[PDB]
Amino acid sequence: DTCIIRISVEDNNGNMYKSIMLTSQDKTPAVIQRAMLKHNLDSDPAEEYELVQVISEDKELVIPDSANVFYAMNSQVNFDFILRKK
Amino acid sequence: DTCIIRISVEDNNGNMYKSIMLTSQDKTPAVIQRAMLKHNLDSDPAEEYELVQVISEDKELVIPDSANVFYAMNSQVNFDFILRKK
Amino acid sequence: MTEYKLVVVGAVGVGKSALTIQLIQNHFVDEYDPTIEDSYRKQVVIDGETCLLDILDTAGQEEYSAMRDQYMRTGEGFLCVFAINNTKSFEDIHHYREQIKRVKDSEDVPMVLVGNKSDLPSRTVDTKQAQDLARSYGIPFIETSAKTRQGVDDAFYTLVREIRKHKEK
Amino acid sequence: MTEYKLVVVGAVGVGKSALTIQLIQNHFVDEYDPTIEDSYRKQVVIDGETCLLDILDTAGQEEYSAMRDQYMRTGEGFLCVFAINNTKSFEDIHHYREQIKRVKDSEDVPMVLVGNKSDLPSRTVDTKQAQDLARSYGIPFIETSAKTRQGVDDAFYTLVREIRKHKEK
Numbered sequence: 001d002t003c004i005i006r007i008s009v010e011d012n013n014g015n016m017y018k019s020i021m022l023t024s025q026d027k028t029p030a031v032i033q034r035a036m037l038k039h040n041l042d043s044d045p046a047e048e049y050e051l052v053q054v055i056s057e058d059k060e061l062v063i064p065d066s067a068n069v070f071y072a073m074n075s076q077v078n079f080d081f082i083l084r085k086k
Numbered sequence: 087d088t089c090i091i092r093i094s095v096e097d098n099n100g101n102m103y104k105s106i107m108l109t110s111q112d113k114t115p116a117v118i119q120r121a122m123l124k125h126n127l128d129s130d131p132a133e134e135y136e137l138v139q140v141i142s143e144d145k146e147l148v149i150p151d152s153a154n155v156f157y158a159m160n161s162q163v164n165f166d167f168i169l170r171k172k
Numbered sequence: 173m174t175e176y177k178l179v180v181v182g183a184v185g186v187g188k189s190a191l192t193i194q195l196i197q198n199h200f201v202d203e204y205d206p207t208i209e210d211s212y213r214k215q216v217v218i219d220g221e222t223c224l225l226d227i228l229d230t231a232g233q234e235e236y237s238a239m240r241d242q243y244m245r246t247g248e249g250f251l252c253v254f255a256i257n258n259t260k261s262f263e264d265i266h267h268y269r270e271q272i273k274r275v276k277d278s279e280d281v282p283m284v285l286v287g288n289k290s291d292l293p294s295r296t297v298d299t300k301q302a303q304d305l306a307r308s309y310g311i312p313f314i315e316t317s318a319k320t321r322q323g324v325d326d327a328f329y330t331l332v333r334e335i336r337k338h339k340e341k
Numbered sequence: 342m343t344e345y346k347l348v349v350v351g352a353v354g355v356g357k358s359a360l361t362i363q364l365i366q367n368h369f370v371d372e373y374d375p376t377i378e379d380s381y382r383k384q385v386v387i388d389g390e391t392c393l394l395d396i397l398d399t400a401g402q403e404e405y406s407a408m409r410d411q412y413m414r415t416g417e418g419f420l421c422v423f424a425i426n427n428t429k430s431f432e433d434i435h436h437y438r439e440q441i442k443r444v445k446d447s448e449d450v451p452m453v454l455v456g457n458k459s460d461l462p463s464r465t466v467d468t469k470q471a472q473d474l475a476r477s478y479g480i481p482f483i484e485t486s487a488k489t490r491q492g493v494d495d496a497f498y499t500l501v502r503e504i505r506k507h508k509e510k
């Protein structure tokens with residue numbers, strides 16, 4: 001299986017996110033390598049970087065470097081709506 | 087088919103959202119009725135309220151009152167991650 | 173500002189939502205409203221410190237049980253609620269505690285045991301039985317009533333203190 | 342502050358990302374990096390007004406085509422890009438315009454036609470052919486080069502002006 005994931009960096013460079021492909025057999029080091037390539041950090045040591053899933057504004061989830069990412073992430077699908085007075 | 091949707095109101099009452107069930111045959115008036123019941127607005131006229139999908143901080147999508155909600159909403163599934171230096 | 177991420181778990185109808193709404197909104201109505209998943213936020217003062225409480229109010233209904241393996245990963249502390257007139261809800265407690273430990277891969281997760289509906293006369297769970305269970309777990313036990321609001325602050329604030337201590341290692 | 346929600350569409354390799362990165366980040370590198378979906382944001386001054394540009398940089402690859410029916414619902418204006426050395430990318434333009442109109446249920450969506458890679462000598466799309474198409478649509482046509490940065494500001498700012506006029510009815 002596969003799915004799209006949005007990757008952001010903390011460089012305040014005007015990029016909000018860049019999307020990459022995630023697969024069911026990807027373990028964390030591979031996803032890190034792919035994310036750094038995508039954000040032009042390929043020449044930098046991958047060991048200095050970590051992969052963090054954003055669940056909400058106050059909730060984050062660090063994927064351990066030994067983990068299959070599909071299995072370790074929160075895969076819950078949510079849609080947000082506002083009940084608004086006209 | 088069915089799915090869970092998170093409903094927020096603009097009352098600054100300490101509630102962030104309340105979840106309700108959405109079905110593939112639900113048209114907008116039914117979802118509005120269900121959302122108002124959930125947020126204790128059942129005694130108020132449903133015609134004064136609208137259903138708005140939040141896509142991002144700056145992107146919203148008003149569901150027209152004549153629409154099947156499954157079909158009119160953006161159903162794209164996104165997962166957000168940060169590539170972070172340790 | 174420190175933020176504490178609290179999760180309220182327990183069986184159908186034990187009073188998870190009623191407790192939460194009393195803490196955040198200061199009101200109680202006897203009304204039927206099964207929960208799928210509700211979220212609340214409030215700034216409070218606990219032990220003189222200003223902080224932010226984020227509270228996830230979860231579903232008792234087993235139809236939504238698949239959601240547990242997800243929301244359990246990101247809670248910092250768990251209020252485990254049974255009702256003192258509902259023996260089956262008391263028997264459920266150990267299953268919630270075992271799942272929380274499993275999902276977090278930790279034998280040491282901040283937790284408080286709450287025996288709710290203490291205003292009722294039709295009691296079936298002995299208070300001493302709940303106290304012994306909580307002692308065997310090493311966690312606090314607090315009897316609450318969302319209807320009279322007895323013990324509502326104590327339950328949630330005791331959980332915050334437990335989290336604070338866990339964070340301080 | 343007004344925010345303008347811009348979407349860049351067009352075939353594989355026409356220069357959608359290169360144009361966007363030049364506008365937002367002011368640099369250009371000849372590099373292979375197919376896009377799935379990237380998002381950018383920048384505060385600018387256009388016609389003396391301070392505003393916020395939100396730019397969605399979309400996939401040319403047809404493998405991701407199912408995403409179109411979604412992102413097309415929430416774009417306010419569309420930069421339709423072909424490359425002047427890529428006739429098939431010019432032939433694709435009318436399909437993007439027809440889909441945008443369909444998804445938005447509107448014959449009047451803010452759009453600008455962009456002929457990119459104008460620095461190249463190996464031209465296969467006649468400039469007058471692009472000008473006639475854009476006239477038949479009633480939209481502006483701008484020739485750009487992300488490599489020299491010619492016309493980058495003009496293309497995006499012309500789209501913003503088109504949106505501003507549509508909003509003013």
Ligand SMILES: Nc1nc2c(ncn2[C@@H]2O[C@H](COP(=O)(O)OP(=O)(O)OP(O)(O)=S)[C@@H](O)[C@H]2O)c(=O)[nH]1
Nearest residue numbers: 185186187188189190202206207232289317318319
């Ligand atoms: N007498 C008394 N009734 C209570 C108390 N707490 C909640 N109730 C009542 O019990 C019933 C269910 O409470 P409620 O908060 O909805 O349960 P829940 O745990 O959130 O239920 P669910 O969402 O998992 S299905 C309601 O009628 C509520 O008013 C209490 O302390 N005392």
Ligand SMILES: Nc1nc2c(ncn2[C@@H]2O[C@H](COP(=O)(O)OP(=O)(O)OP(O)(O)=S)[C@@H](O)[C@H]2O)c(=O)[nH]1
Nearest residue numbers: 354355356357358359371375376401458486487488
């Ligand atoms: N000579 C020249 N090359 C350009 C110009 N714009 C982009 N390119 C080059 O064309 C190639 C593809 O550009 P790029 O921005 O990635 O296309 P894209 O439209 O984003 O492609 P995709 O993501 O839909 S697969 C790259 O090699 C890039 O450097 C230009 O104006 N002139």
Ligand SMILES: [Mg+2]
Nearest residue numbers: 188189206207
């Ligand atoms: Mg409830």
Ligand SMILES: [Mg+2]
Nearest residue numbers: 357358375376
């Ligand atoms: Mg691209």
